Amino acid sequence: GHLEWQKIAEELGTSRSAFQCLQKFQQHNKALKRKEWTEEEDRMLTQLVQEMRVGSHIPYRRIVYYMEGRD
DNA sequence: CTGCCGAAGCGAGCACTACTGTCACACCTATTTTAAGCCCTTCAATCAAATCATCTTTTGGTTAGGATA
């Protein structure tokens, strides 16, 4: 279930640890790197942009702290 | 017309280190020779702290490997 990555590393059998396995998976996890879009992400992105943006300047990536699976 | 002697307030003795006239002998330095240790300067050889140049780790945006909504 993408959980207990110590067990995942042990099952891998190449002497990897949980942290390395998780790092590699997250760097190649479609669920994390959101090529997709969701309604709540769009709504909250619009809300934060409208709250903060002045003129043509918006906090393009500082919104990522609030919305998951982004950069 | 001059002169004696009282009343009250004072007082005593007991309770089983600054100068000056001399004076000779100290102070003082003329140099020799070591043997290991001296203080300060003064520059030179070596060092290490800080700064610059460039490779690289990651933080916002564009590209065409890559994808949903």
Side-chain angles (χ1 to χ4, degrees), chain A residues 20-50:
Chain A
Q20 322 329 299
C21 285
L22 178 61
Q23 173 245 320
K24 189 65 168 169
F25 175 74
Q26 291 288 63
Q27 283 207 254
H28 166 184
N29 173 19
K30 296 181 181 178
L32 184 75
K33 60 182 174 82
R34 277 161 153 76
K35 294 168 135 289
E36 317 175 24
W37 265 127
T38 65
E39 53 278 7
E40 72 285 347
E41 286 173 38
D42 258 20
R43 289 283 80 71
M44 71 75 78
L45 165 65
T46 305
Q47 287 286 359
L48 290 168
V49 165
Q50 194 273 341

PDB file of all heavy atoms in Angstrom, chain A residues 20-50:
ATOM      1  N   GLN A  20      15.775   5.487   1.095  1.00  0.00           N
ATOM      2  CA  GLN A  20      16.166   5.488  -0.313  1.00  0.00           C
ATOM      3  C   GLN A  20      15.038   4.966  -1.197  1.00  0.00           C
ATOM      4  O   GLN A  20      14.766   5.527  -2.266  1.00  0.00           O
ATOM      5  CB  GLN A  20      17.424   4.641  -0.536  1.00  0.00           C
ATOM      6  CG  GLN A  20      18.513   4.694   0.543  1.00  0.00           C
ATOM      7  CD  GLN A  20      18.603   6.022   1.270  1.00  0.00           C
ATOM      8  OE1 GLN A  20      18.864   7.060   0.661  1.00  0.00           O
ATOM      9  NE2 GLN A  20      18.414   5.990   2.582  1.00  0.00           N
ATOM     10  N   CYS A  21      14.386   3.882  -0.774  1.00  0.00           N
ATOM     11  CA  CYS A  21      13.281   3.332  -1.548  1.00  0.00           C
ATOM     12  C   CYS A  21      12.167   4.358  -1.703  1.00  0.00           C
ATOM     13  O   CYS A  21      11.631   4.555  -2.801  1.00  0.00           O
ATOM     14  CB  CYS A  21      12.751   2.065  -0.875  1.00  0.00           C
ATOM     15  SG  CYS A  21      13.799   0.605  -1.070  1.00  0.00           S
ATOM     16  N   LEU A  22      11.806   5.024  -0.605  1.00  0.00           N
ATOM     17  CA  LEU A  22      10.760   6.036  -0.664  1.00  0.00           C
ATOM     18  C   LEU A  22      11.169   7.192  -1.565  1.00  0.00           C
ATOM     19  O   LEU A  22      10.353   7.711  -2.331  1.00  0.00           O
ATOM     20  CB  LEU A  22      10.432   6.543   0.739  1.00  0.00           C
ATOM     21  CG  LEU A  22       9.382   7.657   0.793  1.00  0.00           C
ATOM     22  CD1 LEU A  22       8.057   7.181   0.216  1.00  0.00           C
ATOM     23  CD2 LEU A  22       9.206   8.143   2.215  1.00  0.00           C
ATOM     24  N   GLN A  23      12.422   7.635  -1.464  1.00  0.00           N
ATOM     25  CA  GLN A  23      12.880   8.743  -2.294  1.00  0.00           C
ATOM     26  C   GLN A  23      12.772   8.389  -3.773  1.00  0.00           C
ATOM     27  O   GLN A  23      12.259   9.175  -4.579  1.00  0.00           O
ATOM     28  CB  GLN A  23      14.316   9.113  -1.913  1.00  0.00           C
ATOM     29  CG  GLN A  23      14.984  10.150  -2.809  1.00  0.00           C
ATOM     30  CD  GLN A  23      16.176   9.588  -3.562  1.00  0.00           C
ATOM     31  OE1 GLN A  23      16.961   8.813  -3.015  1.00  0.00           O
ATOM     32  NE2 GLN A  23      16.315   9.976  -4.824  1.00  0.00           N
ATOM     33  N   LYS A  24      13.228   7.190  -4.144  1.00  0.00           N
ATOM     34  CA  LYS A  24      13.150   6.769  -5.542  1.00  0.00           C
ATOM     35  C   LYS A  24      11.701   6.670  -6.005  1.00  0.00           C
ATOM     36  O   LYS A  24      11.344   7.158  -7.087  1.00  0.00           O
ATOM     37  CB  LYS A  24      13.863   5.428  -5.718  1.00  0.00           C
ATOM     38  CG  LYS A  24      14.027   4.985  -7.165  1.00  0.00           C
ATOM     39  CD  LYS A  24      14.939   5.923  -7.936  1.00  0.00           C
ATOM     40  CE  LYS A  24      15.334   5.330  -9.279  1.00  0.00           C
ATOM     41  NZ  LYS A  24      16.008   6.328 -10.153  1.00  0.00           N
ATOM     42  N   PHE A  25      10.843   6.049  -5.193  1.00  0.00           N
ATOM     43  CA  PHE A  25       9.443   5.908  -5.575  1.00  0.00           C
ATOM     44  C   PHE A  25       8.786   7.270  -5.751  1.00  0.00           C
ATOM     45  O   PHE A  25       8.099   7.518  -6.747  1.00  0.00           O
ATOM     46  CB  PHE A  25       8.688   5.084  -4.532  1.00  0.00           C
ATOM     47  CG  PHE A  25       7.210   4.998  -4.788  1.00  0.00           C
ATOM     48  CD1 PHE A  25       6.711   4.202  -5.803  1.00  0.00           C
ATOM     49  CD2 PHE A  25       6.320   5.726  -4.017  1.00  0.00           C
ATOM     50  CE1 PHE A  25       5.351   4.129  -6.039  1.00  0.00           C
ATOM     51  CE2 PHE A  25       4.961   5.656  -4.251  1.00  0.00           C
ATOM     52  CZ  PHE A  25       4.478   4.856  -5.263  1.00  0.00           C
ATOM     53  N   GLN A  26       8.996   8.173  -4.793  1.00  0.00           N
ATOM     54  CA  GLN A  26       8.382   9.492  -4.867  1.00  0.00           C
ATOM     55  C   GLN A  26       8.887  10.257  -6.081  1.00  0.00           C
ATOM     56  O   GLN A  26       8.123  10.977  -6.733  1.00  0.00           O
ATOM     57  CB  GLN A  26       8.666  10.270  -3.583  1.00  0.00           C
ATOM     58  CG  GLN A  26       7.956   9.711  -2.358  1.00  0.00           C
ATOM     59  CD  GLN A  26       6.462   9.968  -2.374  1.00  0.00           C
ATOM     60  OE1 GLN A  26       5.748   9.487  -3.255  1.00  0.00           O
ATOM     61  NE2 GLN A  26       5.979  10.724  -1.395  1.00  0.00           N
ATOM     62  N   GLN A  27      10.177  10.120  -6.397  1.00  0.00           N
ATOM     63  CA  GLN A  27      10.698  10.729  -7.611  1.00  0.00           C
ATOM     64  C   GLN A  27      10.135  10.081  -8.865  1.00  0.00           C
ATOM     65  O   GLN A  27      10.185  10.697  -9.934  1.00  0.00           O
ATOM     66  CB  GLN A  27      12.224  10.654  -7.630  1.00  0.00           C
ATOM     67  CG  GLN A  27      12.888  11.684  -6.736  1.00  0.00           C
ATOM     68  CD  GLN A  27      14.282  12.053  -7.205  1.00  0.00           C
ATOM     69  OE1 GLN A  27      15.278  11.641  -6.609  1.00  0.00           O
ATOM     70  NE2 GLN A  27      14.358  12.839  -8.273  1.00  0.00           N
ATOM     71  N   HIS A  28       9.607   8.858  -8.772  1.00  0.00           N
ATOM     72  CA  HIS A  28       8.954   8.245  -9.923  1.00  0.00           C
ATOM     73  C   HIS A  28       7.579   7.712  -9.498  1.00  0.00           C
ATOM     74  O   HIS A  28       7.242   6.555  -9.749  1.00  0.00           O
ATOM     75  CB  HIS A  28       9.868   7.162 -10.530  1.00  0.00           C
ATOM     76  CG  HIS A  28       9.201   6.227 -11.500  1.00  0.00           C
ATOM     77  ND1 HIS A  28       9.861   5.153 -12.060  1.00  0.00           N
ATOM     78  CD2 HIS A  28       8.008   6.302 -12.140  1.00  0.00           C
ATOM     79  CE1 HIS A  28       9.058   4.542 -12.914  1.00  0.00           C
ATOM     80  NE2 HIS A  28       7.927   5.220 -12.980  1.00  0.00           N
ATOM     81  N   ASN A  29       6.817   8.502  -8.737  1.00  0.00           N
ATOM     82  CA  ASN A  29       5.457   8.137  -8.339  1.00  0.00           C
ATOM     83  C   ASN A  29       4.473   9.047  -9.068  1.00  0.00           C
ATOM     84  O   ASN A  29       4.420  10.251  -8.802  1.00  0.00           O
ATOM     85  CB  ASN A  29       5.274   8.250  -6.826  1.00  0.00           C
ATOM     86  CG  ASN A  29       3.833   8.046  -6.390  1.00  0.00           C
ATOM     87  OD1 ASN A  29       3.020   7.485  -7.128  1.00  0.00           O
ATOM     88  ND2 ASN A  29       3.511   8.501  -5.183  1.00  0.00           N
ATOM     89  N   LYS A  30       3.679   8.468  -9.973  1.00  0.00           N
ATOM     90  CA  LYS A  30       2.678   9.258 -10.683  1.00  0.00           C
ATOM     91  C   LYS A  30       1.696   9.912  -9.721  1.00  0.00           C
ATOM     92  O   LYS A  30       1.226  11.026  -9.977  1.00  0.00           O
ATOM     93  CB  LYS A  30       1.932   8.375 -11.685  1.00  0.00           C
ATOM     94  CG  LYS A  30       2.811   7.828 -12.796  1.00  0.00           C
ATOM     95  CD  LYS A  30       2.001   6.988 -13.767  1.00  0.00           C
ATOM     96  CE  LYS A  30       2.870   6.409 -14.874  1.00  0.00           C
ATOM     97  NZ  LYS A  30       2.095   5.540 -15.803  1.00  0.00           N
ATOM     98  N   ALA A  31       1.378   9.242  -8.611  1.00  0.00           N
ATOM     99  CA  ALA A  31       0.425   9.804  -7.660  1.00  0.00           C
ATOM    100  C   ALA A  31       0.969  11.060  -6.990  1.00  0.00           C
ATOM    101  O   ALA A  31       0.189  11.933  -6.592  1.00  0.00           O
ATOM    102  CB  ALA A  31       0.057   8.759  -6.607  1.00  0.00           C
ATOM    103  N   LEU A  32       2.290  11.168  -6.846  1.00  0.00           N
ATOM    104  CA  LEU A  32       2.875  12.355  -6.231  1.00  0.00           C
ATOM    105  C   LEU A  32       3.038  13.477  -7.249  1.00  0.00           C
ATOM    106  O   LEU A  32       2.483  14.568  -7.079  1.00  0.00           O
ATOM    107  CB  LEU A  32       4.218  12.012  -5.586  1.00  0.00           C
ATOM    108  CG  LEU A  32       4.857  13.173  -4.821  1.00  0.00           C
ATOM    109  CD1 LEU A  32       4.143  13.381  -3.496  1.00  0.00           C
ATOM    110  CD2 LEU A  32       6.337  12.921  -4.598  1.00  0.00           C
ATOM    111  N   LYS A  33       3.796  13.229  -8.319  1.00  0.00           N
ATOM    112  CA  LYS A  33       3.968  14.246  -9.348  1.00  0.00           C
ATOM    113  C   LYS A  33       2.665  14.391 -10.125  1.00  0.00           C
ATOM    114  O   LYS A  33       2.398  13.646 -11.073  1.00  0.00           O
ATOM    115  CB  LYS A  33       5.159  13.910 -10.256  1.00  0.00           C
ATOM    116  CG  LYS A  33       5.087  12.586 -11.009  1.00  0.00           C
ATOM    117  CD  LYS A  33       6.359  12.365 -11.819  1.00  0.00           C
ATOM    118  CE  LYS A  33       6.389  10.990 -12.466  1.00  0.00           C
ATOM    119  NZ  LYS A  33       5.614  10.925 -13.734  1.00  0.00           N
ATOM    120  N   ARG A  34       1.843  15.349  -9.701  1.00  0.00           N
ATOM    121  CA  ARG A  34       0.484  15.521 -10.211  1.00  0.00           C
ATOM    122  C   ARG A  34       0.514  16.172 -11.585  1.00  0.00           C
ATOM    123  O   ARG A  34       0.452  17.394 -11.729  1.00  0.00           O
ATOM    124  CB  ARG A  34      -0.353  16.339  -9.236  1.00  0.00           C
ATOM    125  CG  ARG A  34      -0.943  15.525  -8.099  1.00  0.00           C
ATOM    126  CD  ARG A  34      -1.368  16.402  -6.938  1.00  0.00           C
ATOM    127  NE  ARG A  34      -2.448  15.797  -6.168  1.00  0.00           N
ATOM    128  CZ  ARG A  34      -2.297  14.802  -5.306  1.00  0.00           C
ATOM    129  NH1 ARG A  34      -1.120  14.231  -5.103  1.00  0.00           N
ATOM    130  NH2 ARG A  34      -3.358  14.359  -4.638  1.00  0.00           N
ATOM    131  N   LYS A  35       0.615  15.330 -12.613  1.00  0.00           N
ATOM    132  CA  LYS A  35       0.245  15.746 -13.958  1.00  0.00           C
ATOM    133  C   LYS A  35      -1.253  16.000 -14.064  1.00  0.00           C
ATOM    134  O   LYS A  35      -1.702  16.620 -15.034  1.00  0.00           O
ATOM    135  CB  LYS A  35       0.672  14.671 -14.958  1.00  0.00           C
ATOM    136  CG  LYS A  35       2.177  14.498 -15.054  1.00  0.00           C
ATOM    137  CD  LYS A  35       2.554  13.238 -15.815  1.00  0.00           C
ATOM    138  CE  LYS A  35       3.662  13.492 -16.820  1.00  0.00           C
ATOM    139  NZ  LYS A  35       3.204  14.309 -17.973  1.00  0.00           N
ATOM    140  N   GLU A  36      -2.024  15.532 -13.085  1.00  0.00           N
ATOM    141  CA  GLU A  36      -3.475  15.611 -13.095  1.00  0.00           C
ATOM    142  C   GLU A  36      -3.953  16.925 -12.477  1.00  0.00           C
ATOM    143  O   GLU A  36      -3.166  17.781 -12.061  1.00  0.00           O
ATOM    144  CB  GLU A  36      -4.068  14.424 -12.337  1.00  0.00           C
ATOM    145  CG  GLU A  36      -3.398  13.086 -12.633  1.00  0.00           C
ATOM    146  CD  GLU A  36      -3.931  11.959 -11.771  1.00  0.00           C
ATOM    147  OE1 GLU A  36      -5.074  12.070 -11.280  1.00  0.00           O
ATOM    148  OE2 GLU A  36      -3.204  10.959 -11.583  1.00  0.00           O
ATOM    149  N   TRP A  37      -5.276  17.078 -12.415  1.00  0.00           N
ATOM    150  CA  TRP A  37      -5.934  18.191 -11.747  1.00  0.00           C
ATOM    151  C   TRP A  37      -7.120  17.685 -10.939  1.00  0.00           C
ATOM    152  O   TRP A  37      -7.775  16.706 -11.309  1.00  0.00           O
ATOM    153  CB  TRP A  37      -6.409  19.256 -12.751  1.00  0.00           C
ATOM    154  CG  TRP A  37      -5.446  20.392 -12.950  1.00  0.00           C
ATOM    155  CD1 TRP A  37      -4.941  20.848 -14.136  1.00  0.00           C
ATOM    156  CD2 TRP A  37      -4.917  21.255 -11.934  1.00  0.00           C
ATOM    157  NE1 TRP A  37      -4.110  21.919 -13.916  1.00  0.00           N
ATOM    158  CE2 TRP A  37      -4.081  22.191 -12.574  1.00  0.00           C
ATOM    159  CE3 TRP A  37      -5.061  21.319 -10.544  1.00  0.00           C
ATOM    160  CZ2 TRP A  37      -3.391  23.178 -11.875  1.00  0.00           C
ATOM    161  CZ3 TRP A  37      -4.374  22.299  -9.849  1.00  0.00           C
ATOM    162  CH2 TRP A  37      -3.550  23.216 -10.516  1.00  0.00           C
ATOM    163  N   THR A  38      -7.390  18.363  -9.826  1.00  0.00           N
ATOM    164  CA  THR A  38      -8.525  18.049  -8.970  1.00  0.00           C
ATOM    165  C   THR A  38      -9.259  19.333  -8.609  1.00  0.00           C
ATOM    166  O   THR A  38      -8.697  20.430  -8.643  1.00  0.00           O
ATOM    167  CB  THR A  38      -8.094  17.309  -7.692  1.00  0.00           C
ATOM    168  OG1 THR A  38      -7.287  18.169  -6.880  1.00  0.00           O
ATOM    169  CG2 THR A  38      -7.311  16.046  -8.034  1.00  0.00           C
ATOM    170  N   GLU A  39     -10.542  19.178  -8.273  1.00  0.00           N
ATOM    171  CA  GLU A  39     -11.389  20.338  -8.000  1.00  0.00           C
ATOM    172  C   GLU A  39     -10.898  21.127  -6.790  1.00  0.00           C
ATOM    173  O   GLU A  39     -10.841  22.362  -6.831  1.00  0.00           O
ATOM    174  CB  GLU A  39     -12.844  19.899  -7.799  1.00  0.00           C
ATOM    175  CG  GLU A  39     -13.079  18.806  -6.749  1.00  0.00           C
ATOM    176  CD  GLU A  39     -12.828  17.401  -7.267  1.00  0.00           C
ATOM    177  OE1 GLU A  39     -12.343  17.262  -8.410  1.00  0.00           O
ATOM    178  OE2 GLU A  39     -13.112  16.436  -6.527  1.00  0.00           O
ATOM    179  N   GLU A  40     -10.548  20.441  -5.698  1.00  0.00           N
ATOM    180  CA  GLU A  40     -10.142  21.160  -4.494  1.00  0.00           C
ATOM    181  C   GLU A  40      -8.835  21.910  -4.718  1.00  0.00           C
ATOM    182  O   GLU A  40      -8.669  23.034  -4.231  1.00  0.00           O
ATOM    183  CB  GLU A  40     -10.023  20.201  -3.304  1.00  0.00           C
ATOM    184  CG  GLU A  40      -8.838  19.238  -3.331  1.00  0.00           C
ATOM    185  CD  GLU A  40      -9.019  18.097  -4.311  1.00  0.00           C
ATOM    186  OE1 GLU A  40     -10.151  17.905  -4.802  1.00  0.00           O
ATOM    187  OE2 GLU A  40      -8.028  17.391  -4.590  1.00  0.00           O
ATOM    188  N   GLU A  41      -7.896  21.307  -5.451  1.00  0.00           N
ATOM    189  CA  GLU A  41      -6.649  22.001  -5.749  1.00  0.00           C
ATOM    190  C   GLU A  41      -6.909  23.271  -6.546  1.00  0.00           C
ATOM    191  O   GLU A  41      -6.347  24.326  -6.241  1.00  0.00           O
ATOM    192  CB  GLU A  41      -5.695  21.078  -6.507  1.00  0.00           C
ATOM    193  CG  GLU A  41      -5.057  20.002  -5.642  1.00  0.00           C
ATOM    194  CD  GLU A  41      -4.259  18.996  -6.448  1.00  0.00           C
ATOM    195  OE1 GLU A  41      -3.589  19.405  -7.420  1.00  0.00           O
ATOM    196  OE2 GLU A  41      -4.299  17.795  -6.106  1.00  0.00           O
ATOM    197  N   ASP A  42      -7.767  23.196  -7.565  1.00  0.00           N
ATOM    198  CA  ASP A  42      -8.077  24.385  -8.353  1.00  0.00           C
ATOM    199  C   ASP A  42      -8.747  25.453  -7.497  1.00  0.00           C
ATOM    200  O   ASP A  42      -8.378  26.634  -7.559  1.00  0.00           O
ATOM    201  CB  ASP A  42      -8.979  24.012  -9.532  1.00  0.00           C
ATOM    202  CG  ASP A  42      -8.223  23.925 -10.847  1.00  0.00           C
ATOM    203  OD1 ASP A  42      -6.984  23.768 -10.822  1.00  0.00           O
ATOM    204  OD2 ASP A  42      -8.875  24.014 -11.910  1.00  0.00           O
ATOM    205  N   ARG A  43      -9.729  25.055  -6.686  1.00  0.00           N
ATOM    206  CA  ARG A  43     -10.453  26.020  -5.863  1.00  0.00           C
ATOM    207  C   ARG A  43      -9.519  26.720  -4.886  1.00  0.00           C
ATOM    208  O   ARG A  43      -9.525  27.951  -4.770  1.00  0.00           O
ATOM    209  CB  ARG A  43     -11.584  25.313  -5.114  1.00  0.00           C
ATOM    210  CG  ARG A  43     -12.740  24.882  -5.999  1.00  0.00           C
ATOM    211  CD  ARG A  43     -13.636  26.059  -6.367  1.00  0.00           C
ATOM    212  NE  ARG A  43     -13.094  26.875  -7.448  1.00  0.00           N
ATOM    213  CZ  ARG A  43     -13.025  26.497  -8.718  1.00  0.00           C
ATOM    214  NH1 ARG A  43     -13.432  25.299  -9.106  1.00  0.00           N
ATOM    215  NH2 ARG A  43     -12.536  27.344  -9.619  1.00  0.00           N
ATOM    216  N   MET A  44      -8.697  25.947  -4.176  1.00  0.00           N
ATOM    217  CA  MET A  44      -7.793  26.537  -3.197  1.00  0.00           C
ATOM    218  C   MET A  44      -6.678  27.341  -3.858  1.00  0.00           C
ATOM    219  O   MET A  44      -6.253  28.366  -3.311  1.00  0.00           O
ATOM    220  CB  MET A  44      -7.242  25.429  -2.299  1.00  0.00           C
ATOM    221  CG  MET A  44      -6.259  24.491  -2.975  1.00  0.00           C
ATOM    222  SD  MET A  44      -4.622  25.181  -3.233  1.00  0.00           S
ATOM    223  CE  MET A  44      -3.974  25.026  -1.582  1.00  0.00           C
ATOM    224  N   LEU A  45      -6.192  26.907  -5.023  1.00  0.00           N
ATOM    225  CA  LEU A  45      -5.212  27.702  -5.754  1.00  0.00           C
ATOM    226  C   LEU A  45      -5.796  29.055  -6.131  1.00  0.00           C
ATOM    227  O   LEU A  45      -5.154  30.096  -5.945  1.00  0.00           O
ATOM    228  CB  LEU A  45      -4.755  26.937  -7.000  1.00  0.00           C
ATOM    229  CG  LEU A  45      -4.001  27.711  -8.085  1.00  0.00           C
ATOM    230  CD1 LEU A  45      -2.663  28.204  -7.569  1.00  0.00           C
ATOM    231  CD2 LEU A  45      -3.817  26.841  -9.320  1.00  0.00           C
ATOM    232  N   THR A  46      -7.024  29.060  -6.655  1.00  0.00           N
ATOM    233  CA  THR A  46      -7.677  30.323  -6.981  1.00  0.00           C
ATOM    234  C   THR A  46      -7.843  31.188  -5.738  1.00  0.00           C
ATOM    235  O   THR A  46      -7.589  32.397  -5.775  1.00  0.00           O
ATOM    236  CB  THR A  46      -9.037  30.058  -7.632  1.00  0.00           C
ATOM    237  OG1 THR A  46      -8.869  29.193  -8.762  1.00  0.00           O
ATOM    238  CG2 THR A  46      -9.682  31.362  -8.088  1.00  0.00           C
ATOM    239  N   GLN A  47      -8.268  30.583  -4.626  1.00  0.00           N
ATOM    240  CA  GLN A  47      -8.474  31.351  -3.401  1.00  0.00           C
ATOM    241  C   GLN A  47      -7.181  32.013  -2.942  1.00  0.00           C
ATOM    242  O   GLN A  47      -7.153  33.216  -2.657  1.00  0.00           O
ATOM    243  CB  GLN A  47      -9.030  30.445  -2.303  1.00  0.00           C
ATOM    244  CG  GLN A  47     -10.483  30.051  -2.502  1.00  0.00           C
ATOM    245  CD  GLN A  47     -11.433  31.197  -2.216  1.00  0.00           C
ATOM    246  OE1 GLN A  47     -11.008  32.290  -1.845  1.00  0.00           O
ATOM    247  NE2 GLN A  47     -12.726  30.955  -2.394  1.00  0.00           N
ATOM    248  N   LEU A  48      -6.095  31.240  -2.857  1.00  0.00           N
ATOM    249  CA  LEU A  48      -4.831  31.797  -2.384  1.00  0.00           C
ATOM    250  C   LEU A  48      -4.291  32.848  -3.347  1.00  0.00           C
ATOM    251  O   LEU A  48      -3.793  33.897  -2.915  1.00  0.00           O
ATOM    252  CB  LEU A  48      -3.811  30.677  -2.173  1.00  0.00           C
ATOM    253  CG  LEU A  48      -4.102  29.758  -0.982  1.00  0.00           C
ATOM    254  CD1 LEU A  48      -3.234  28.509  -1.015  1.00  0.00           C
ATOM    255  CD2 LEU A  48      -3.895  30.508   0.326  1.00  0.00           C
ATOM    256  N   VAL A  49      -4.390  32.597  -4.654  1.00  0.00           N
ATOM    257  CA  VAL A  49      -3.926  33.577  -5.630  1.00  0.00           C
ATOM    258  C   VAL A  49      -4.689  34.884  -5.466  1.00  0.00           C
ATOM    259  O   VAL A  49      -4.096  35.966  -5.407  1.00  0.00           O
ATOM    260  CB  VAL A  49      -4.062  33.015  -7.057  1.00  0.00           C
ATOM    261  CG1 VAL A  49      -3.944  34.125  -8.086  1.00  0.00           C
ATOM    262  CG2 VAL A  49      -3.008  31.950  -7.303  1.00  0.00           C
ATOM    263  N   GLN A  50      -6.018  34.802  -5.381  1.00  0.00           N
ATOM    264  CA  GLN A  50      -6.821  36.010  -5.235  1.00  0.00           C
ATOM    265  C   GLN A  50      -6.502  36.723  -3.926  1.00  0.00           C
ATOM    266  O   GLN A  50      -6.480  37.958  -3.870  1.00  0.00           O
ATOM    267  CB  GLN A  50      -8.307  35.659  -5.313  1.00  0.00           C
ATOM    268  CG  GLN A  50      -9.225  36.860  -5.498  1.00  0.00           C
ATOM    269  CD  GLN A  50      -9.628  37.510  -4.187  1.00  0.00           C
ATOM    270  OE1 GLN A  50      -9.529  36.903  -3.120  1.00  0.00           O
ATOM    271  NE2 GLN A  50     -10.098  38.750  -4.266  1.00  0.00           N
TER     272      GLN A  50
END
